[PDB]
Design a protein around this ligand. Structure first.
Ligand SMILES: CC(=O)N[C@@H]1[C@@H](O[C@@H]2O[C@H](CO)[C@@H](O[C@@H]3O[C@H](CO)[C@H](O)[C@H](O[C@]4(C(=O)O)C[C@H](O)[C@@H](NC(C)=O)[C@H]([C@H](O)[C@H](O)CO)O4)[C@H]3O)[C@H](O)[C@H]2NC(C)=O)[C@@H](O)[C@@H](CO)O[C@H]1O
Ligand SMILES: CC(=O)N[C@@H]1[C@@H](O[C@@H]2O[C@H](CO)[C@@H](O[C@@H]3O[C@H](CO)[C@H](O)[C@H](O[C@]4(C(=O)O)C[C@H](O)[C@@H](NC(C)=O)[C@H]([C@H](O)[C@H](O)CO)O4)[C@H]3O)[C@H](O)[C@H]2NC(C)=O)[C@@H](O)[C@@H](CO)O[C@H]1O
Ligand SMILES: CC(=O)N[C@@H]1[C@@H](O[C@@H]2O[C@H](CO)[C@@H](O[C@@H]3O[C@H](CO)[C@H](O)[C@H](O[C@]4(C(=O)O)C[C@H](O)[C@@H](NC(C)=O)[C@H]([C@H](O)[C@H](O)CO)O4)[C@H]3O)[C@H](O)[C@H]2NC(C)=O)[C@@H](O)[C@@H](CO)O[C@H]1O
Ligand SMILES: *[C@@H]1O[C@H](CO)[C@@H](O[C@@H]2O[C@H](CO)[C@@H](O)[C@H](O)[C@H]2NC(C)=O)[C@H](O)[C@H]1NC(C)=O
Ligand SMILES: *[C@@H]1O[C@H](CO)[C@@H](O[C@@H]2O[C@H](CO)[C@@H](O)[C@H](O)[C@H]2NC(C)=O)[C@H](O)[C@H]1NC(C)=O
Ligand SMILES: *[C@@H]1O[C@H](CO)[C@@H](O[C@@H]2O[C@H](CO)[C@@H](O)[C@H](O)[C@H]2NC(C)=O)[C@H](O)[C@H]1NC(C)=O
Ligand code: NAG
Ligand code: NAG
Ligand code: NAG
Ligand code: NAG
Ligand code: NAG
Ligand code: NAG
Lengths: 169, 318, 318, 169, 318, 169
């Protein structure tokens, strides 16, 4: 009945946010989403979208005819030019998406690390990493204490004695 | 006591591509390549004309098909495959250049050129241009000799564009089915037509000869055109086989022309067209038609390019 | 006790470029720009014809050089610099458009047009088209008067394309060295040739005059061509100086044409060609020829663009 | 006779993998490669290669003539269009490679950090970073113990007492 | 005791764009899109000619305007809007192709063609080509009959290019205001001019007729040109209405031509030009003129694209 | 009168470098810039600049005429081709800058982390992270000691006893 964070697996139960907390104490188990990290990732992804929505004001007109086919020589030049341009935009589109997707994934992993590193700095010397994205807290941390961590109101000085004792022996 | 940091995930994951992986699952994705076509011409807000059986070039010369469009005005011009520029069989020289000009003209304003004739018939008509009875191009005059085989007098007609826009002038050369028919209409001897401007100089000789029957006729009228600069003058020197213009054309303003085979809708609002309808999309790309015109997303070969709108999907350990 | 984490490295490092650095060493790299050319035309799997001395346009008219290719069939067509479309000096009107059409024709199928003549010679031959003795274009007929200086009768010949593909029709206008020679062949008076279709109308007058001797001849035959739509008819009205076609051409299917100066190889399999040979490569780019045709990597200016296939190389502290 | 990991220098002796372990104990010195990290990096690099091998089905035909030069005006238009397109693809190629190479290098550095961070989480409180990419292990770690770390079968609980003692004094 | 790691920051931050954010502040940025134009033609190091009133094509035929440039030499050629290729009203056939050739010619070297005439006037002159008195194109000969209405003898003139470069040959066809004027100059009857080469064949007939007065004249001379390959010969067969060349042209080497309406500066050194001046910039892009020529940064729609040259700017907590 | 490092705020007083140190001890407060980290970031940014300065040797000539307008059909083909190419380069320019800027920002954040992680490895077990980009040093660190950290001449072994004592109790 153990819990685990990121590093081999996500949470299909975290349904009110992208990033979140999952704890277990005497009160039991609980899961809550982090706003600041989730909002950052959403703002960046939506930022990409608006960027790819920015329409062009370039208007193009007919250069050939599909009812009355134009002269062969100029027609083939036109077709050759268009097909060349389509090759370019098809390439650009392919590369744009692949580039953006790689970045979207990476910035998402970045936010996860930033949240994990933040919590690590909050708990100071009162906890240890279990290697599954979780922190073993070496003191009693009730629901109120867990909530204090989530809203960055956790003062490590309060639990330092109790924790260092349990850690050292 | 324990606290864990994590991220959401789904079983409903969608695959995308990156620089490295092909088919890596992410939580959420959206399409960038538009494939959803509206099989109509969305014309709301745009003054639209459906030429139908009238060819676009026909609006200048005036076959019966284009009688409604002799001075048409539009923001959006639609050519139809059934359209024809011609009643009496023939074709324009440099037709496509002229089409491209008229497609963005905003329509045409016609103005009389004021040609008067003496010792000559101008009532040239044909069965191919039936308007109630036999007739001819509405903006043109078919000039004959007077009786039959009679000599056609050498003539010289000029016209100045007293306006601030360039004038579109069209004239026609008639090619009879035989030298016999050419003589019966314009008299014996070789025939010459010269057209002079201040930036244009061309010459024309008729070519009588048997040709396949089109509209029951083996004769051909090929039309020629130029743009007359303001205050400049065109001069016509001829002695037969000449189809004279009655009125000149002036471009109204700005428009866009398309070729389509689908109906029009004045409810939908669009700005990107193709022969199959309208593309309305905020997406950067489309896979519907490479020759789509207006304000359009760039055409691409691929039908689908998914953009990850969510993090990489990692399933929970069960 | 100690454990260290590390990565491999070499002294055999290769430099690449990034957004920031120029010449940063990585462990391993590969080339993206192809420069390795195969100086042959790799034709395995492709039905290939080497026209050699026969010009591609010559396959339609039929000089002696092209007698083997009058109805050739191919997947890959190869033009050679030594090729010539002509025996009797002259040239095609809109030649390049016609070449582009034949390069992807898949070859040609010839069919008689069925023209019969009376009161006229058709055995026009020349020293420039030697085939055993003096001769002429294999698919064409050089029409004369009958004796010498005799009047050439006005004639009208028509042909319908009863097939489902467009027909390629070629005719020639003969320009004599003098008005004396034109009269000796076709009689006195001015000469006219008109060609009528249902989407084509043109006219032709000969131009007698002294010209530089080519193949010993100062006369010129310029060829003209059109594509005849199915069930449509072409009509020829003429009275001299006319080179009549004997057979029409029909395109077999699909092919690709190249211009090359290197030998052919039916062992190698390729799909990208240039005048210097074949480019076989999985690389995205090439620096061999910008005008390479077929299925090719994109041409680029650079001869080398190295793609890092290994990590950044950091030498061990000695 | 000290050993060092990444951070100023790679290993020219690591010849059976991209990333690896190098230890020293009473049994002496040894070096072994890590599979999972090496395979990840190779899969990503090969992934790029297949991506740049994806051929085009666009066929192009001759638009001019190098035996019989076409008309000057249309010829110059053709040349101008081609040279413009070559400029575009030359740019794209230059940018593509430079972009990919920067990413290849970075993802490679990423794998190194991930391996280092993994080991750090395995050893828990039984070791310290020397700042050269190595871990000073504050207990006896024989070859069997070193191997236990490489295959992630190292249980820190087993050595915690011995290590914390040697660390604190 | 405490030590903190940090980075610099400013209140003077500038906004840039990324894949994600729009208007994110960085410490420092620079422009990539050049908008700074030098309203001069920077010609230092380049041999420059300012044709002024002389049209570029006029350098070959030689109206009075181009007398200084009949054999000009240059690295940089500048056309002016006031320039004119013509004294006697008319125009070149395929003019733009010829311009493009001369713009990169490096200038022209003229050489006599050595035509001699008998039983004919060559002193044809006009009021439109005033040079002291009435005159004509400097490189051309206006051929007449001899007296008035007299018959123009059939003539045949040939010229071989004995040089290693192609020769530029120009001739003109004269179109009189009436058939009366044509007869007064070249005699009665129809007139023909044929031009023969070994890769060129064309024909010309005059077109007498009334045209608008340009420079007081209603007549037109339209010029025609070809490039003569080395050791090849051109032959002129004619009987009137022919404007003969006196000298041929040979291209000197290499140059670049521009069209401008701004002054020249031999102090500034540039390599990218447009009608408004010179673009000197190390920046990759520019927003000044899409039709800029020479060695230029690529033209773009945007007037500004800022490149971050510093880290993201984060203000200090006060 | 507290000091803070990166993580919510930069230093508008750091005017002789991009990255730097800010300390407080008995001698007071001081701020100095780090060369190696600053020079790395500057070398990379200038590296981008030279890359975008690399001029093209492709020369282009006039293909139309703005005094005597060319024929309509070929003129519209030319205009259509040019406008298509301008669309491509405008896109490329837009994408190039946005891509480079994202990378410039990220590589700059990377250098900050690398400097912070370096110092963390120097201080070993003699300090703790306060979560504001600073290190609480659990021993006496005068100006000479602070300088020893900046030039990587800090030997943690010297202060280990004193520090571990103050940390544990
Ligand atoms: C040419 C040909 O096919 N060879 C014939 C065969 O075909 C007949 O040819 C004649 C002559 O070309 C055709 O006569 C034309 O028929 C038209 C209807 O099809 C029409 O009636 C033409 O008359 C008008 C017209 O109404 O348009 C009369 C107008 O008043 C004229 N207007 C002016 C200003 O003159 C006008 C002009 O005369 C011409 O249009 C100018 O080109 O035309 C009329 O000329 C006849 O229709 C053809 N019939 C058939 C069945 O093909 C056969 O006669 C064949 C029999 O063996 O003999 C060949 O010589
Ligand atoms: C025109 C010219 O150079 N001026 C001459 C000089 O050159 C001679 O010109 C004549 C006339 O042009 C040349 O005669 C031609 O020679 C050909 C071989 O070179 C050939 O023999 C031509 O005869 C045929 C042919 O065999 O091809 C005979 C065919 O039966 C004809 N076929 C038909 C259907 O009629 C055919 C046609 O008559 C023409 O090809 C149609 O254009 O040609 C023959 O006409 C002669 O070769 C030239 N000789 C030289 C040395 O250049 C000199 O005579 C010069 C002397 O001072 O005088 C000039 O007037
Ligand atoms: C055509 C026309 O407008 N209709 C007339 C009216 O206009 C007059 O037309 C005549 C005939 O076209 C004009 O005569 C020409 O005037 C020129 C000056 O404007 C010039 O004088 C022309 O003479 C020369 C010349 O100097 O250039 C004489 C050279 O020696 C000739 N060179 C050679 C080698 O022959 C040369 C040639 O003859 C021609 O240039 C070849 O085309 O020209 C001269 O011909 C007259 O200027 C026009 N005047 C006006 C006011 O428009 C009126 O006469 C009108 C009255 O009702 O009648 C119409 O028929
Ligand atoms: C999956 O991605 C799509 C695309 O971004 C999201 O759909 C968007 O939702 C927002 C807000 O509801 C709208 O403003 C957009 O117009 C929508 N786009 C499309 C294409 O429908 C969708 O919300 C995402 N899924 C989840 C679960 O967040
Ligand atoms: C250096 O990179 C090249 C290119 O990726 C590697 O050569 C490839 O090797 C694999 C497997 O042996 C083949 O599938 C590829 O076809 C090879 N490519 C080429 C261009 O030869 C090479 O193995 C790398 N070097 C090292 C030491 O790994
Ligand atoms: C802001 O960025 C600009 C552009 O890189 C810097 O100006 C450059 O300064 C260097 C050295 O002084 C010169 O080699 C470049 O030519 C300059 N470029 C330009 C466009 O002027 C400027 O130094 C930066 N600002 C700061 C405070 O570093
Ligand atoms: C241009 O492309 C279209 C569609 O592929 C084709 O139908 C047309 O024939 C081409 N133009 C010419 C001149 O071949
Ligand atoms: C208009 O044309 C006349 C002759 O037709 C000419 O004299 C005048 O200069 C032209 N321009 C103006 C503005 O009148
Ligand atoms: C074929 O041509 C004939 C006349 O030549 C015409 O009547 C017919 O409509 C055409 N089409 C078919 C399918 O027969
Ligand atoms: C097109 O480019 C080729 C190779 O640079 C050149 O030989 C040819 O002359 C150019 N075309 C024209 C019409 O100049
Ligand atoms: C030059 O022209 C002459 C005839 O004018 C021809 O015989 C010769 O082969 C040509 N070439 C050379 C190199 O003389
Ligand atoms: C080409 O573009 C220019 C500038 O937009 C325009 O003035 C010109 O008319 C265009 N060319 C044609 C043939 O319309």
């Amino acid at each position: 009945g153990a819990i685990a964070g990121f590093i081999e697996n996500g949470w299909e139960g975290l349904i009110d946010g992208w990033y979140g907390f999952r704890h277990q104490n005497a009160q039991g188990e609980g899961t809550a989403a982090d706003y600041k990290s989730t909002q950052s990732a959403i703002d960046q992804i939506t930022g990409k979208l608006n960027r790819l929505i920015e329409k062009t004001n370039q208007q193009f007109e007919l250069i050939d005819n599909e009812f009355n086919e134009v002269e062969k020589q100029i027609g083939n030049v036109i077709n050759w030019t268009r097909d060349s341009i389509t090759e370019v935009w098809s390439y650009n589109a392919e590369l744009l998406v692949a580039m953006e997707n790689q970045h979207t994934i990476d910035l998402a992993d970045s936010e996860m690390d930033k949240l994990y590193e933040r919590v690590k700095r909050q708990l100071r010397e009162n906890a240890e990493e279990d290697g599954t994205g979780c922190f073993e807290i070496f003191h009693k941390c009730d629901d109120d204490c867990m909530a204090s961590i989530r809203n960055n109101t956790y003062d490590h000085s309060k639990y330092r004695e109790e924790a260092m004792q349990n850690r050292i022996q | 006591d324990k606290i864990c940091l994590g991220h959401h995930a789904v079983s409903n994951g969608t695959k995308v591509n990156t620089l490295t992986e092909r088919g890596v699952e992410v939580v959420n994705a959206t399409e960038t390549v538009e494939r959803t076509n509206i099989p109509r011409i969305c014309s709301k807000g745009k003054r639209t004309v459906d030429l139908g059986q009238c060819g676009l070039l026909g609006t200048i010369t005036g076959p019966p098909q284009c009688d409604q469009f002799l001075e048409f005005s539009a923001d959006l011009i639609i050519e139809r495959r059934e359209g024809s520029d011609v009643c009496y069989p023939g074709k324009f020289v440099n037709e496509e250049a002229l089409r491209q000009i008229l497609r963005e003209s905003g329509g045409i304003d016609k103005e009389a050129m004021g040609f008067t004739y003496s010792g000559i018939r101008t009532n040239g008509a044909t069965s191919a241009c039936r308007r109630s009875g036999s007739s001819f191009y509405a903006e043109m005059k078919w000039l004959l000799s007077n009786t039959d085989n009679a000599a056609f007098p050498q003539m010289t007609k000029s016209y100045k564009n007293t306006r601030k826009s360039p004038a579109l002038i069209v004239w026609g050369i008639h090619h009879s089915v035989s030298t016999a028919e050419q003589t019966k209409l314009y008299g014996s001897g070789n025939k010459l037509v010269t057209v002079g401007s201040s930036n244009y100089q061309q010459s024309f000789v008729p070519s009588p000869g048997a040709r396949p029957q089109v509209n029951g006729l083996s004769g051909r009228i090929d039309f020629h055109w130029l743009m007359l600069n303001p205050n400049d003058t065109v001069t016509f020197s001829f002695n037969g086989a000449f189809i004279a213009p009655d009125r000149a054309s002036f471009l109204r303003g700005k428009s866009m022309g398309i070729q389509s085979g689908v109906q029009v809708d004045a409810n939908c609002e669009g700005d990107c067209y193709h022969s199959g309808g309208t593309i309305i999309s905020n997406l950067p790309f489309q896979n519907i038609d490479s020759r789509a015109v207006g304000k359009c997303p760039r055409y691409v070969k691929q039908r689908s390019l998914l953009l990850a709108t969510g993090m990489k999907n990692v399933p929970e350990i069960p």
